[PDB]
């Protein structure tokens, strides 16, 4: 029964070596596939009788003299040459699994393990996967042995064109689908109705530029960040960012190393992941000059540019923008132009298809309407309003 139990990585002790255990964790890194020799085939130059060496370790030493009876009986010291055509290779790949961040005891470093996977089971894993893996827990030559898990079986943790008619036949689907966008958020149905059109999109023709963009602006709060996150959930090919957030690969692209090792690579930011899709910029007012010129290049070329380390290149970034320009100094002055309240230049704002300024006005009547909605959602736990027909 022991193979059935999913062990966390730090429960894998030395006594398990040789057993077909099952482990649980997150894959923090994955190798590119490379071939490994099962059997080397050598041709013999002076007799043509091939010979074979099987390999059963991380290293080997190649053969030199023809050991075959064809040469050996003739005492003919022929020379051996490796053939990749005739050698049997197997696909090899390595992945580093780490215990889940929740499993780490208080103060300990998260423990990790090498998984080796061979044959057709290769490229069943990817970084960020949370997964259960069966394998043989094994030593390797470094008395302290190196150790790894030989993977054997994997459990990842994670018609339509007829089925659309079920909603079409019910009618008024635009109004209802817009009302299905974040039903837990009060009112603002005209804004939701526009935000839906950004997912649906216009025409691109030849060029004619087809993406649709909206800026929300004005006082902080009013469930706006949740609305942007909800759009990222609802929409296909969506991504959520902030003007300073997503601070790893970033919203703005660059050439990069993997400084944990020594190689270099070019990789895209969020605006490339949002390609053929939609990007949501929270804290939009706070993004820097490189970020602003990045969204400029989305709107002006539908690309993001590279000009570094001898590489000049533009990466494709066809994408809708949803944006949230919350003002300076904590609150908008609700009778002024936005440029007296917002950091961003009006040039950038002019490229958006629509801009919605919304103010968090204290007004007893609208306060009670909003508060009745919020308190009802908290009280009832279901159907954030009636007759909205919230589609999943």
């Amino acid at each position: 029964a022991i193979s059935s139990k999913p062990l966390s990585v730090r429960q894998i002790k030395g006594d398990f070596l040789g057993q077909l255990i099952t482990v649980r964790g997150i894959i923090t890194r994955v190798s590119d596939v490379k071939p490994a020799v099962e059997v080397i085939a050598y041709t013999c130059d002076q007799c043509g009788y091939e010979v074979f060496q099987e390999v059963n370790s991380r290293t080997f030493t190649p053969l030199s003299e023809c050991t075959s009876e064809e040469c050996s009986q003739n005492q003919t010291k022929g020379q051996l040459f490796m053939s990749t055509r005739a050698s049997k290779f197997s696909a090899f790949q390595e992945c580093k699994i780490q215990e889940l961040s929740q499993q780490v005891p208080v103060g300990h470093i998260p423990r990790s393990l090498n998984i080796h996977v061979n044959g057709t089971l290769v490229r069943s894993l990817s970084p960020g996967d949370i997964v259960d893996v069966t394998g043989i827990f094994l030593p390797a030559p470094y008395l302290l042995t190196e150790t790894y898990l030989e993977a054997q079986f994997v459990r990842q943790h994670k018609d339509v064109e007829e089925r659309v008619m079920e909603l079409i036949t019910s009618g008024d689907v635009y109004n209802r689908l817009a009302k299905s966008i974040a039903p837990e958020i009060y009112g603002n149905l005209d804004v939701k109705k526009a935000l839906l059109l950004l997912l649906v999109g216009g025409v691109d023709k030849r060029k004619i530029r087809g993406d649709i963009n909206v800026c929300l602006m004005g006082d902080p709060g009013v469930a706006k960040s949740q609305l942007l996150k909800a759009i990222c959930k609802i929409s296909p090919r969506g991504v959520y960012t902030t003007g300073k957030g997503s601070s790893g690969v970033g919203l703005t692209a660059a050439v990069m190393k993997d400084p944990v090792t020594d190689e270099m690579i070019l990789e895209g930011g969020a605006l490339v992941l949002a390609d053929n899709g939609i990007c949501c910029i929270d804290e939009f007012d706070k993004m820097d000059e490189s970020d602003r010129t990045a969204i400029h290049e989305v709107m002006e070329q539908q690309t993001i540019s590279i000009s570094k380390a001898g590489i000049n290149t533009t990466l494709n970034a066809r994408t809708s923008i949803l944006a949230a320009a919350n003002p300076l100094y904590g609150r908008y002055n609700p009778r002024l132009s936005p440029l007296d309240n917002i950091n961003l230049p009006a040039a950038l704002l002019s490229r958006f298809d629509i801009l919605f300024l919304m103010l968090d006005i204290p007004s007893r009547d609208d306060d009670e309407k909003l508060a009745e909605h919020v308190t009802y959602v908290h009280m009832h736990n279901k159907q954030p309003d009636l007759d909205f027909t919230p589609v999943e």
């Binding site: 030395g14 070596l17 970084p127 008395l143 944990v260 904590g330 308190t375 009802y376």
Partner: protein, 615 residues
């Protein structure tokens, strides 16, 4: 003398010792039957016994001093006698461990000296540089392809044995004497866990103008991961030299000393100089009897931090955070956060940090800080690992953040995800994922320059943005009031503290640093355990439902706050409304009440109005 001759006498003498003190035999059988029962129905205890050096002294002083001074000759026969005893019990090597009265062999990494080599020693210290656990090969088993026999080989190094034996150099044999090829058998082959830990001297003991010394303990199998970095520990083991020490002819420089170690026999963490509590019928009765009284929200909160002058509303708010609000997953699993977050702005020297101590020692699953999650790397890692910050570690727990004004930009930018989404997102090295960080936070902060200016906002006295400060449900400002009654009280407490004279010291005698190693011979306010048991019982027994009369008080108070002059102090908004719902729910959890009702909202709104507006 040749040890092998007297080995039998030492075995039978330790067997007589084991018979004389039968509690060791009883412990051996207790371990065996526990392991048998865990095997019987699909946890395992180790083959280790802690023997008292006092018992062994009273039995045979000559054998006892042999164990202390010559463990390389006296431990192996004693462990052989123990193994024979365990084998004599009905249906693998057993190990010894030691406790008590080491005398001159009670040491620290400073006073551990070359005179002590190969003696049994106890070292008082602090753990640093815990290595990764590695499996160490000690027996390799091999099926012979044609011969049929299972050949094997045992292995030796300077750490696996208490006495010197020729090292066996880490090679698997692959051929029989007859030349037949061998296939190595994992599982049947035996590997022991192996770990190195660097015990540092306690810095309190280190004398004037000296760095703390340190030494490497070696730990095998069931002693591995007994401790983590920073643990104050007492280790017992044999102090040893190893290696060639530059006597080997490669080394022109022979001034280098020999490497030295302790081979560990036991690891005692010194936690003392309940995370989930037991509950007796007395506790069940008195918890429920107390819950029917009205002033519990005063008495329980005032039982927090009883040394603190004033700050009743702060203690009440702390109690509501400890009994925080209920989670709301709506339809489609749409998540809204029930947890509560608090921030104590103010002067230094106020109650803040001491309140964080009292909260930290009262709460459970509580993390001390002075964040989020990260992708990280270190000196020896040729690899990157995903790390948990305090909020991830406090998932469904609490975080205590002192000096929160000091936190750096990459942290503060990502705190928004904790505050809005109760989660944190990773965005580099292809680990694009999101982690649960569903905690209730209490933070404290100081002015960045000068004393706190009570006219200026928290956004102005401290560099933290208003768009960050506004995330917290409750935002207190505390200040060092110069009240003579308070000052008289705390002054006399501090004077009584500084008049303390330790036991048996003469008047004016200086306190000696020698202490802990020299003694290394091994108004109805409630108790904090009772308060813990009450909050545990509340979390254990109720999830209050939200009644409409509560809603009517809540919308009344929110729309009042959002249209009274309180608007001129703060732009009161939707976050304040859901905060009122959380705080009223928390007060229902104070009551243990099956529902939230109008009474809870009336308390919560008074506290929130005080916290934000001071009234």
């Amino acid at each position: 003398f040749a040890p092998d001759a007297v080995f039998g006498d030492r075995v039978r003498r330790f067997q007589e010792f084991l018979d004389t003190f039968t509690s060791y035999r009883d412990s051996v059988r207790s371990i065996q039957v526990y392991n048998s029962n865990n095997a019987a129905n699909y946890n395992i205890l180790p083959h280790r016994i802690i023997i008292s050096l006092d018992d062994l002294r009273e039995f045979d002083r000559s054998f006892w001093s042999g164990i202390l001074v010559e463990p390389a000759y006296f431990i192996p026969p004693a462990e052989k006698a123990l193994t024979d005893l365990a084998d004599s019990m009905d249906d693998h090597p057993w190990k010894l461990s030691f406790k008590g009265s080491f005398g001159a062999h009670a040491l620290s990494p400073r006073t551990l000296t070359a005179q002590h080599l190969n003696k049994l020693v106890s070292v008082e210290g602090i753990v640093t540089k815990t290595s990764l656990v590695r499996p160490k090969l000690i027996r390799s088993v091999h099926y012979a392809a044609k011969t049929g026999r299972f050949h094997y080989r045992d292995y030796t190094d300077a750490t696996t044995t208490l006495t010197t034996r020729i090292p066996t150099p880490a090679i698997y044999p692959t051929e029989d004497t007859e030349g037949n090829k061998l296939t190595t058998e994992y599982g049947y082959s035996t590997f022991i866990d192996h770990q190195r830990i660097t015990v540092q001297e306690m810095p309190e003991m280190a004398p004037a103008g000296q760095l703390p010394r340190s030494i490497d303990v070696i730990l095998d199998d069931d002693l591995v991961d007994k401790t983590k970095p920073g643990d104050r520990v007492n280790v017992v083991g044999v102090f040893k030299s190893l290696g060639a020490g530059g006597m080997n002819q490669s080394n022109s420089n022979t001034l280098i000393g020999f490497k030295t170690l302790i081979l560990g026999n036991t690891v005692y963490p010194l936690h003392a100089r309940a995370a989930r509590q037991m509950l007796t019928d007395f506790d069940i009765r008195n918890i429920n009897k107390l819950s029917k009284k009205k002033d519990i929200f005063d008495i329980l909160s005032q039982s927090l931090a009883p040394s603190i002058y004033g700050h009743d509303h702060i203690k009440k708010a702390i109690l509501l955070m400890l009994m925080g609000g209920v989670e709301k997953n709506l339809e489609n699993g749409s998540h809204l956060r029930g947890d509560i977050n608090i921030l104590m702005v103010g002067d230094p020297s106020t109650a803040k940090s001491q309140l964080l101590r009292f909260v930290l020692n009262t709460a459970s699953l509580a993390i001390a800080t002075t964040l989020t999650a990260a992708v990280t790397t270190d000196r020896e890692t040729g690899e990157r690992r995903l790390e948990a910050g305090a909020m991830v570690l406090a998932d469904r727990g609490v975080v205590c953040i002192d000096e929160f004004d000091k936190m750096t930009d990459v942290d503060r930018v990502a705190i928004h995800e904790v505050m809005e989404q109760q989660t944190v997102t990773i965005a580099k090295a292809g680990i694009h994922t999101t982690l649960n960080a569903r905690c209730s936070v209490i933070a404290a902060a100081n002015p960045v320059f000068g004393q706190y200016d009570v006219n200026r906002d928290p956004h102005q006295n401290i560099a933290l943005p208003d768009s960050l400060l506004s995330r917290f449900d409750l935002l207190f400002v505390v200040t060092d009031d110069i009240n003579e009654i308070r000052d008289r009280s705390i002054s006399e407490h501090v004077l009584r503290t500084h008049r303390y004279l330790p036991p048996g010291y003469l008047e004016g005698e200086p306190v000696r640093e020698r202490l802990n190693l020299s003694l290394a011979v091994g108004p109805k306010l409630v108790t904090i355990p009772f308060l813990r048991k009450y909050v545990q019982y509340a979390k254990e027994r109720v999830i209050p439902q939200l009644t409409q009369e509560a809603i009517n008080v809540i919308v009344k108070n929110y729309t009042d706050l959002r249209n009274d002059d309180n608007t001129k102090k703060s732009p009161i908004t939707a976050r304040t409304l859901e905060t009122l719902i959380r705080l009223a729910t928390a007060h229902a959890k104070v009551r243990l009440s099956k529902t939230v009702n109008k009474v809870d909202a009336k308390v919560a709104a008074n506290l929130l109005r005080f916290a934000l507006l001071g009234e």
